[PDB]
Tab-separated table of all heavy atoms in Angstrom:
chain	number	residue	atom	x	y	z
Y	1	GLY	N	0.841	-1.226	-0.015
Y	1	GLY	CA	-0.002	-0.005	0.036
Y	1	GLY	C	0.843	1.249	-0.013
Y	1	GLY	O	2.060	1.185	-0.006
Y	2	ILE	N	0.189	2.437	0.048
Y	2	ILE	CA	0.827	3.739	-0.104
Y	2	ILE	C	0.869	4.387	1.281
Y	2	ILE	O	-0.014	5.034	1.708
Y	2	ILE	CB	0.030	4.665	-1.073
Y	2	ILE	CG1	-0.094	3.936	-2.421
Y	2	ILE	CG2	0.698	5.991	-1.242
Y	2	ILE	CD1	-1.411	4.316	-3.181
Y	3	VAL	N	2.041	4.106	1.928
Y	3	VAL	CA	2.201	4.517	3.306
Y	3	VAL	C	2.627	6.027	3.324
Y	3	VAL	O	3.789	6.340	3.317
Y	3	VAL	CB	3.290	3.641	3.978
Y	3	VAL	CG1	3.602	4.147	5.410
Y	3	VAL	CG2	2.796	2.211	4.040
Y	4	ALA	N	1.649	6.920	3.328
Y	4	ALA	CA	1.953	8.380	3.294
Y	4	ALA	C	0.780	9.190	3.809
Y	4	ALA	O	-0.278	8.704	4.161
Y	4	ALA	CB	2.203	8.788	1.845
Y	5	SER	N	1.043	10.534	3.842
Y	5	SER	CA	0.002	11.509	4.189
Y	5	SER	C	-1.174	11.468	3.188
Y	5	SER	O	-0.931	11.167	2.003
Y	5	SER	CB	0.606	12.949	4.182
Y	5	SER	OG	0.982	13.366	2.889
Y	6	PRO	N	-2.386	11.813	3.670
Y	6	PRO	CA	-3.599	11.596	2.792
Y	6	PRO	C	-3.560	12.310	1.399
Y	6	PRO	O	-4.141	11.752	0.471
Y	6	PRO	CB	-4.691	12.226	3.649
Y	6	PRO	CG	-4.199	12.102	5.010
Y	6	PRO	CD	-2.720	12.361	4.971
Y	7	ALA	N	-2.903	13.448	1.332
Y	7	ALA	CA	-2.809	14.200	0.069
Y	7	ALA	C	-1.789	13.585	-0.894
Y	7	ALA	O	-2.121	13.323	-2.111
Y	7	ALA	CB	-2.396	15.615	0.399
Y	8	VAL	N	-0.636	13.316	-0.362
Y	8	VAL	CA	0.429	12.617	-1.088
Y	8	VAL	C	-0.021	11.261	-1.583
Y	8	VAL	O	0.163	10.851	-2.758
Y	8	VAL	CB	1.738	12.530	-0.346
Y	8	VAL	CG1	2.770	11.653	-1.011
Y	8	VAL	CG2	2.302	13.916	-0.059
Y	9	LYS	N	-0.739	10.560	-0.652
Y	9	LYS	CA	-1.297	9.260	-0.885
Y	9	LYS	C	-2.232	9.337	-2.093
Y	9	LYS	O	-2.194	8.436	-2.999
Y	9	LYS	CB	-2.035	8.728	0.314
Y	9	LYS	CG	-2.579	7.259	0.154
Y	9	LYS	CD	-3.637	6.981	1.201
Y	9	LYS	CE	-3.136	7.121	2.621
Y	9	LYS	NZ	-3.987	6.458	3.650
Y	10	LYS	N	-3.161	10.311	-2.061
Y	10	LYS	CA	-4.104	10.501	-3.204
Y	10	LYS	C	-3.361	10.752	-4.462
Y	10	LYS	O	-3.749	10.126	-5.531
Y	10	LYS	CB	-5.034	11.616	-2.863
Y	10	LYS	CG	-6.314	11.663	-3.775
Y	10	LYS	CD	-7.153	10.442	-3.561
Y	10	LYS	CE	-8.539	10.626	-4.210
Y	10	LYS	NZ	-9.396	11.597	-3.461
Y	11	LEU	N	-2.440	11.646	-4.461
Y	11	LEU	CA	-1.594	11.977	-5.652
Y	11	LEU	C	-1.004	10.668	-6.171
Y	11	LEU	O	-0.981	10.523	-7.408
Y	11	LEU	CB	-0.465	12.916	-5.362
Y	11	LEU	CG	0.298	13.419	-6.646
Y	11	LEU	CD1	0.608	14.940	-6.654
Y	11	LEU	CD2	1.567	12.646	-7.058
Y	12	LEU	N	-0.515	9.792	-5.355
Y	12	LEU	CA	0.081	8.538	-5.830
Y	12	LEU	C	-0.931	7.574	-6.335
Y	12	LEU	O	-0.666	6.852	-7.292
Y	12	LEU	CB	0.961	7.965	-4.713
Y	12	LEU	CG	2.235	8.739	-4.423
Y	12	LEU	CD1	2.791	8.241	-3.083
Y	12	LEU	CD2	3.203	8.495	-5.583
Y	13	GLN	N	-2.120	7.430	-5.681
Y	13	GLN	CA	-3.180	6.563	-6.146
Y	13	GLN	C	-3.666	6.988	-7.486
Y	13	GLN	O	-4.054	6.116	-8.284
Y	13	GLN	CB	-4.406	6.666	-5.212
Y	13	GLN	CG	-4.242	5.928	-3.864
Y	13	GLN	CD	-5.408	6.215	-2.943
Y	13	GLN	OE1	-6.514	6.519	-3.398
Y	13	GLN	NE2	-5.162	6.096	-1.667
Y	14	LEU	N	-3.666	8.271	-7.797
Y	14	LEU	CA	-4.071	8.800	-9.139
Y	14	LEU	C	-3.125	8.258	-10.231
Y	14	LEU	O	-3.643	7.806	-11.237
Y	14	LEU	CB	-4.007	10.310	-9.228
Y	14	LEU	CG	-5.118	11.069	-8.452
Y	14	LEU	CD1	-4.942	12.559	-8.759
Y	14	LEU	CD2	-6.501	10.605	-8.648
Y	15	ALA	N	-1.830	8.301	-9.970
Y	15	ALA	CA	-0.861	7.759	-10.887
Y	15	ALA	C	-1.013	6.314	-11.222
Y	15	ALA	O	-0.788	5.938	-12.366
Y	15	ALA	CB	0.547	8.002	-10.286
Y	16	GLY	N	-1.390	5.484	-10.239
Y	16	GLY	CA	-1.434	4.050	-10.337
Y	16	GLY	C	-0.107	3.506	-9.829
Y	16	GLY	O	0.496	2.616	-10.420
Y	17	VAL	N	0.325	4.065	-8.662
Y	17	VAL	CA	1.461	3.526	-7.938
Y	17	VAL	C	0.807	2.791	-6.801
Y	17	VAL	O	0.260	3.384	-5.841
Y	17	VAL	CB	2.362	4.635	-7.439
Y	17	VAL	CG1	3.450	4.083	-6.605
Y	17	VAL	CG2	2.892	5.411	-8.602
Y	18	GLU	N	0.847	1.441	-6.840
Y	18	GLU	CA	0.107	0.589	-5.942
Y	18	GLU	C	0.707	0.523	-4.548
Y	18	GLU	O	0.010	0.612	-3.536
Y	18	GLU	CB	-0.084	-0.816	-6.484
Y	18	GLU	CG	-0.838	-0.813	-7.859
Y	18	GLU	CD	-0.624	-2.035	-8.668
Y	18	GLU	OE1	0.494	-2.537	-8.781
Y	18	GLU	OE2	-1.665	-2.536	-9.190
Y	19	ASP	N	2.039	0.327	-4.539
Y	19	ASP	CA	2.841	0.059	-3.289
Y	19	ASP	C	4.104	0.896	-3.259
Y	19	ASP	O	4.982	0.761	-4.067
Y	19	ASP	CB	3.167	-1.439	-3.260
Y	19	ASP	CG	1.925	-2.365	-3.569
Y	19	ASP	OD1	0.913	-2.197	-2.888
Y	19	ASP	OD2	2.086	-3.243	-4.441
Y	20	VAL	N	4.189	1.696	-2.186
Y	20	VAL	CA	5.333	2.655	-2.091
Y	20	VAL	C	5.383	3.241	-0.654
Y	20	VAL	O	4.345	3.603	-0.067
Y	20	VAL	CB	5.180	3.802	-3.115
Y	20	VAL	CG1	3.851	4.609	-2.926
Y	20	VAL	CG2	6.412	4.728	-3.034
Y	21	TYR	N	6.600	3.319	-0.049
Y	21	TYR	CA	6.822	3.949	1.236
Y	21	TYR	C	7.155	5.455	0.950
Y	21	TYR	O	7.685	5.753	-0.099
Y	21	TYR	CB	7.952	3.364	1.953
Y	21	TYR	CG	7.754	1.902	2.380
Y	21	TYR	CD1	8.603	0.907	1.877
Y	21	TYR	CD2	6.769	1.552	3.170
Y	21	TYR	CE1	8.451	-0.423	2.195
Y	21	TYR	CE2	6.511	0.230	3.554
Y	21	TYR	CZ	7.389	-0.772	3.076
Y	21	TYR	OH	7.173	-2.080	3.443
Y	22	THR	N	6.792	6.300	1.906
Y	22	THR	CA	7.167	7.724	1.840
Y	22	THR	C	7.753	8.289	3.189
Y	22	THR	O	7.490	7.764	4.226
Y	22	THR	CB	5.981	8.593	1.419
Y	22	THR	OG1	4.994	8.620	2.557
Y	22	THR	CG2	5.262	8.076	0.222
Y	23	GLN	N	8.489	9.368	3.083
Y	23	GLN	CA	8.757	10.201	4.225
Y	23	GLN	C	8.696	11.678	3.824
Y	23	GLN	O	8.409	12.007	2.686
Y	23	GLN	CB	10.234	9.936	4.711
Y	23	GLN	CG	10.447	8.519	5.206
Y	23	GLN	CD	11.902	8.365	5.661
Y	23	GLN	OE1	12.660	9.368	5.856
Y	23	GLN	NE2	12.294	7.116	5.817
Y	24	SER	N	8.809	12.510	4.896
Y	24	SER	CA	8.916	13.947	4.675
Y	24	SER	C	9.608	14.705	5.803
Y	24	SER	O	9.705	14.211	6.965
Y	24	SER	CB	7.544	14.469	4.362
Y	24	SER	OG	6.665	14.144	5.418
Y	25	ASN	N	10.040	15.923	5.446
Y	25	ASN	CA	10.694	16.823	6.398
Y	25	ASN	C	9.965	18.167	6.318
Y	25	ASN	O	9.060	18.314	5.509
Y	25	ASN	CB	12.114	17.020	5.977
Y	25	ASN	CG	13.044	17.240	7.146
Y	25	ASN	OD1	12.639	17.810	8.168
Y	25	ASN	ND2	14.351	16.920	6.953
Y	26	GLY	N	10.388	19.117	7.168
Y	26	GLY	CA	9.821	20.493	7.110
Y	26	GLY	C	8.369	20.569	7.506
Y	26	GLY	O	7.781	19.602	7.957
Y	27	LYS	N	7.771	21.752	7.316
Y	27	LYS	CA	6.397	21.971	7.719
Y	27	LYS	C	5.460	21.512	6.633
Y	27	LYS	O	5.016	22.204	5.758
Y	27	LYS	CB	6.172	23.439	8.017
Y	27	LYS	CG	4.920	23.779	8.784
Y	27	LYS	CD	5.162	24.974	9.721
Y	27	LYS	CE	3.981	25.905	9.887
Y	27	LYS	NZ	4.234	26.975	10.928
């Protein structure tokens, strides 16, 4: 699955990236 923030997750679901880890920094 797409382990990320809801917005980034949505962006990735749109693409058709089924399985991917994420991180982030800053505000």
Side-chain angles (χ1 to χ4, degrees):
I2 304 150
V3 176
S5 68
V8 171
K9 186 200 298 196
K10 194 64 166 290
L11 189 139
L12 288 165
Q13 286 173 26
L14 289 186
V17 177
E18 300 162 315
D19 311 308
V20 59
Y21 297 120
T22 69
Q23 295 180 15
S24 57
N25 211 332
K27 192 146 147 176

